[PDB]
Design a protein around this ligand. Structure first.
Ligand SMILES: [Ca+2]
Length: 240
């Protein structure tokens, strides 16, 4: 998250840290959203590599014990059947992870609230992206969970020539693009929390940013639109 601020310890309990094993240590690679005690929603490109992944819930500072973390292995990885690694712009950048064991829910570990199927946000809707991603284009991961206010940019505006054009699809949510604030590598798979009817709901799964950089003016951060995959998500959980 570029241009973000440190999130309060208990502000986003559905946020998880997706890490991969590197030698005798673990490294954070992506964010995710706990949607079931034993299911995590994340981006498909996050689990493209043939790595050993673990999920960490109740996490705040990646380099020191917070006394609230729960570490659990990933038992099954269900990537959307239409996901294509060489085509993030096509969409379908979403995956569900079945945890080896159900995590305990508390003040720091809660199931993310998902929006009703088909729900689209009005232009300039209030949202916050959260994650441990780079704090600067080509920079380094944040030690503590960060958050950035990224108002949405409706499809009409986002799919225009001045913005993302046809690169952005209707199955995606755009947010930010003010040149200062945005998601960045490491935030991928994480949530875009948007305020609707007084309640925050995870409307997006961080997918991509401009190859020119993370915080690029008129190149808002693009997220997989969660409301387009409600049936897909229910189907997977109901058969796994
Ligand atoms: Ca920690």
């Amino acid at each position: 998250v570029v241009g973000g601020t440190e999130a309060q310890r208990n502000s986003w309990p559905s946020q998880i840290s997706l890490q991969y094993r590197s030698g005798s240590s673990w490294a954070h690679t992506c964010g995710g959203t706990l949607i079931r005690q034993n299911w995590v929603m994340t981006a498909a490109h996050c689990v493209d590599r043939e790595l050993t992944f673990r999920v960490v819930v109740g996490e705040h500072n990646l380099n020191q014990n917070n006394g609230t973390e729960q570490y659990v292995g990933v038992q099954k990885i269900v990537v959307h059947p239409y996901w294509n690694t060489d085509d993030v712009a096509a969409g379908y950048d979403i995956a569900l992870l079945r945890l080896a064991q159900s995590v305990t829910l508390n003040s720091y570990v809660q199931l993310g609230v998902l929006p009703r199927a088909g729900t689209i946000l009005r232009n300039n809707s209030p949202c916050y992206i959260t994650g441990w991603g780079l704090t600067r284009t080509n920079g380094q991961l944040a030690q503590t969970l960060q958050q950035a206010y990224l108002p949405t940019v409706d499809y009409a505006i986002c799919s225009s020539s001045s913005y993302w054009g046809s690169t952005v699809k209707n199955s995606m949510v755009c947010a930010g693009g003010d040149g200062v604030r945005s998601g960045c590598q490491g935030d991928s798979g994480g949530p875009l929390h948007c305020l609707v009817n007084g309640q925050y709901a995870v409307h997006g799964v961080t997918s991509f940013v401009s190859r020119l950089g993370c915080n690029v003016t008129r190149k808002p951060t693009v997220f997989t639109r969660v409301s387009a995959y409600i049936s897909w998500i229910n189907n997977v959980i109901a058969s796994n």
